[PDB]
């Protein structure tokens, strides 16, 4: 899902080195496991991400802080595009509403004005951003088209949370297992501690993420402290259901955005989305008025100092 912006040394969510070649500036929109393969402690090329994303990157992939130029969201920053003090480029990061520390990259330079949305959840608060309200003409919109496919309809983030509450409402005497990825859906955990008036059980790593975000003190790591446990999504399987059901009558919930058949009756696959709906995007593009939209073309005039930067 990485993107090499053609005729630029720009790479967003791309870390293959050998497949890039021309790339010299690598951006990280958010810290989901799917957009970061090749990133580790051996990574030694400049990297730009959001504040929260900077903490999560150094801590959980052991990436050296010397390669992580973290920039504040909302503000525009001047990045070099060569080895001399000549060409530069402005980047403005915009909150993506997708997950903790998720951003949208807005580039400006010899290539034009490119807006990279990455993964993002649309809300009309996004149009009111000062970066996109100066009437600037975006030349290319690398847009999140996840829910633009006409295949299978996934409910919104709030529709799925309603079904989860109805599910636990019908099982008041049950232990609830919730499978998640390494990031996202922490605010949903908060909504379940309120509705059901329990403490939510996490792993120590997940507890660190939550305190990093500034959420309510409704979480704990003691197993016996609550009926709702948050576990890794790869834990929810037929073998583990029998293991949990041997102790206490347990229900398992899998919030996923893919077609999955429950391999156990007490496993409930709930369709999540976490991306903008089609109509939300069609109003998002009708407001931006971009010259062209690219899913996740014109060749610019590469300067002399930038053409050398790409070939070393
Ligand atoms: Ni993501």
Author numbering: 2 to 297, 314 to 329
Quote the paper:
SNM1B is a member of the metallo-β-lactamase (MBL) structural superfamily, of which the β-CASP (CPSF, Artemis, SNM1, PSO2) nucleic acid processing nucleases are a subfamily. The SNM1B sequence comprises 532 amino acids, wherein the N-terminal region (amino acids 1–332) contains the catalytic (MBL and β-CASP) domains, and the C-terminal region the protein-protein interaction regions, including the well-characterised TRF2 binding domain (amino acids 498–509).
In addition to the structure of SNM1B1–355 (nucleotide form) we solved a structure of unliganded SNM1B1–355 to 2.8 Å resolution, hereafter denoted SNM1B1–355 (apo form). Presumably, these regions are relatively flexible and move to form favourable interactions with DNA upon substrate binding. However, whether these structures represent the catalytically or physiologically relevant forms of SNM1B is not clear, and it is likely that the presence of Ni in both the apo and nucleotide form crystals is due to the use of Ni-Sepharose in the purification process.
